[PDB]
Write a protein that binds this ligand. Structure first.
Ligand SMILES: O=C(O)[C@H](O)[C@@H](O)[C@H](O)[C@H](O)COP(=O)(O)O
Ligand SMILES: O=C(O)[C@H](O)[C@@H](O)[C@H](O)[C@H](O)COP(=O)(O)O
Ligand SMILES: C[As](C)(=O)[O-]
Ligand SMILES: C[As](C)(=O)[O-]
Lengths: 470, 470
């Protein structure tokens, strides 16, 4: 009783690895899982560690120090509500529940409010870095009551990854209620976008240039020594090494091209839509997953619909470099879009999000970890109030220099008939963002024509309606 | 008392014009509005007509035949709930409330259920065609209880527009509860997409080819005599005629390029996201509106960010024709996407939507009215179970023949630096849909790598996880 410093509910791998992460920092950790068998499997395999085995929820709670720190690592949605409901009667006022699941932020906003009514603190935290990150050092995105966060921060700072630049822990207070799960949702949105960008690059190298997994692996390896340096490119060249475990060739080539999803990317796009925020790249990424889901229909369509025939007339080495430039340029478009979303959300939900710190805590631990996140944190260091990453001098320059290459890649791919939905949205966003005038004047004219919706003018203040008919 | 055949609540223009539409078919119509002054303005201007002036809600209800038919034409959201709440105690079981507002369908699903608990019928109806359509002949998309719909159908069939092909009324039963507002939501989604497609075509003709409003008007006029024949192109060339009412030149050129929206397009995209349905074109259209909203930022970015310089080396007449082909091709992509959404929604909410009839009732009255809607109704006539419009022989052929032109337009626009977010998503969707294999295999590999998310194989049944680490 009161021997454990911290508790984890949910002994699937994420929750197990997190419990192990905490323990490895010199704490005693009570472990609990709904089906007792899984808790026993963890406990026996890790008997050497300072883990307290609990079989009932009261035994779990009873084993914890006041104020209790309990991390929930269960299935998002109804399973998380059920766990909270099960825990609530066993807790005392001042106790701290932490939801580390990939929860949709409005649920966190609702959970925070109702748990406050019972005098229980609720910290909705994003945990990024996969199963290995949860064990060795995640990026963490906590939101909720500051006072409660301050009580958990020491442990969070110990388990989190350190940025290689300055050794800063990749965790920080995001803000009130759902602020942390919101940032995490944007993280995953951006993740989808990067993976889709990398998929298109892979597809271009494979279909237009006819290159092999070994060749593409070497290209990604070389890319990762430069400004593109990121965890996602790293695991890409790694995935491309691996043999099929049940046949000839490579495992990547035997995986069915139907991308799964567990909601976060979709939620990011849904939020952008809600907020009035242009988020084309990450949204196209989500839709790219959905269209891969339509495999059966795609098989049928392949036999019916025609495309261009491919004979590549250019220089491989220099086209590879154009694609490299287009990848980096396009990532900049997507992060630019993503941070503008965080900005509008911060205003909408009154979170006063620390944009530069968000960048800082993504430098290590998280899936989107990359060297260029330092560049993003520098832009916000210069101007905390920066409206868009593209107006920072580092990114102005890159876009100035890489856009010619993007245009060439877009033309090549489109004429070859290779699908590049995110590369194309990348350049479209750039040309829209930089246009002083867009053809939305005509859209407003049509709207006023059929619907009397009114418009503003270019030459004077006020709201106007035109007599289109009389 | 019981003299009026039908009632309209909401004397803004849509509701007034609808009340007038009904009256003009030989019915007596009771009119009501929250602020009495507006009802008086309508009544006096239309004293000749068979309108019953009501000043209180009881007077309005008391004036109607049992079972009462009351159409609500008020602001969507809370104003519609408030009107329902105000009406409910004055009604008798069997009465029929009809919500003709642009209501988000889940509100209709909720409203239908709770009103059924009180024995009141609820018909959520989409009304399309603008203020002029509401007066002269809308397209109508009713959902709710069939028995209640059958009682209102005679009047709906009279007020609705007739298809010029076969004189069929542009109204039909869509299905239960929210089915009608869902179809209407998709209608407006598709509308956004067409307007954005037309905006890009306009922008290309204006910026790349340096053409004038008179020139572009003549191009759209000629286009509208062919297969592109549609109401939206019609009002486009019409808008392009009109002089500035407060200065020199044309009104279109003095309208501020900030597209407004009232939710429906956003809801369409949000629904596609929910359903797992690829809807890139209509979604890019929504985002195109959002980015025009960012005018202040765009002004700043124009001064900082660089693009290519434009010198057009080609033949105007033939580039115009390529753009024409690209417009038609892209509309086909968007409707294809839109009908696939209706298909997944029908399954999700158990509506058994009549896809061919939906096409039929969009042939006239609605904003997206066009000759090619007959082609869509023919595709569903052939196969009611058709998975995607692109697998119909009429559209297979068009895409086969127009895709070369789209690729050329995309290349031209991208190299010129003119933003074409929907033209580019159009070709990306086509090349994705027709690909037997997509690079989503790599996405699944990365997901399994960092998150152990599992995959399916190309060569055998079952779910697999790979040992990426040991
Ligand atoms: O940052 C991370 O550690 C991952 O993103 C993590 O949140 C998990 O892997 C999710 O499943 C998201 O990915 P999916 O939506 O593609 O499943
Ligand atoms: O079909 C119609 O008659 C219109 O679409 C109508 O529903 C109205 O004009 C809306 O306002 C939609 O357009 P917005 O979202 O652009 O306002
Ligand atoms: C001003 As209006 C016709 O959008 O309600
Ligand atoms: C099978 As899994 C790691 O997506 O819960």
């Amino acid at each position: 009783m009161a021997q454990a410093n911290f508790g984890v509910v949910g002994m699937a791998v994420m929750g197990k690895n997190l419990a192990l992460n905490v323990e490895s920092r010199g704490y005693t950790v009570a472990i609990y899982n709904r089906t007792t068998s899984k808790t026993e499997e963890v406990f026996k395999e890790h008997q050497d560690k300072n883990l307290v085995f609990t079989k009932t929820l009261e035994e779990f709670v009873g084993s914890l120090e006041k104020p209790r720190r309990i991390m929930l690592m269960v299935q998002a949605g109804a399973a998380t509500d059920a766990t909270i409901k099960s825990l609530l009667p066993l807790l005392d006022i001042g106790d701290i529940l932490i939801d580390g699941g990939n929860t949709h932020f409005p649920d966190t906003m609702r959970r925070n409010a109702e748990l406050a009514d019972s005098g229980i603190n609720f910290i909705g935290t994003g945990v990024s870095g996969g199963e290995k990150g949860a064990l060795l050092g995640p990026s963490m995105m906590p939101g909720g009551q500051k006072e409660a966060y301050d009580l958990v921060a020491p442990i969070f700072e110990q388990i989190a990854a350190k940025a290689p630049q300055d050794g800063k822990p990749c965790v920080a207070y995001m803000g009130a209620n759902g602020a942390g799960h919101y940032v995490k949702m944007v993280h995953n949105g951006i993740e989808y976008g990067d993976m889709q960008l990398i998929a298109e690059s892979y597809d271009l190298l494979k279909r237009i240039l006819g290159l092999s997994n070994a060749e593409i692996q070497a290209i990604f390896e070389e890319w990762n020594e430069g400004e593109l340096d990121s965890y996602l490119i790293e695991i890409t060249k790694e995935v491309l090494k691996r043999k099929d475990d049940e046949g000839e060739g490579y495992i990547v080539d035997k995986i069915l091209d139907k991308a799964g999803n567990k909601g976060t990317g979709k939620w990011t796009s849904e939020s952008a839509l809600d907020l009035g925020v242009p988020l084309p790249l990450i949204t196209e990424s989500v839709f790219a997953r959905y269209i891969s889901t339509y495999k059966d229909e795609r098989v049928k369509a392949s036999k019916v619909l025609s495309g261009p025939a491919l004979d590549f007339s250019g220089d491989k080495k220099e086209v590879i470099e154009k694609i490299r430039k287009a990848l980096y340029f396009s990532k900049i478009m997507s992060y630019a879009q993503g941070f503008a979303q965080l900005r509008k959300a911060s205003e909408e939900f009154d979170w006063d999000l620390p944009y530069g710190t968000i960048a800082q805590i993504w430098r290590a631990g998280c899936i989107i970890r990359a060297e260029f996140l330092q560049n993003i944190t520098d832009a916000f260091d210069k101007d905390s109030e920066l409206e868009n990453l593209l107006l920072d001098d580092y990114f102005v320059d890159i876009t100035k220099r890489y856009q010619e290459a993007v245009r060439d890649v877009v033309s090549l791919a489109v004429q070859a008939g290779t699908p590049i939905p995110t590369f194309t949205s990348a350049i479209s966003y750039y040309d829209s963002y930089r246009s002083e005038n867009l053809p939305a004047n005509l859209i407003q004219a049509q709207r006023d024509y059929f619907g009397a919706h009114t418009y503003e003018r270019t030459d004077k203040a006020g709201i106007f309606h035109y007599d289109w008919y009389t």
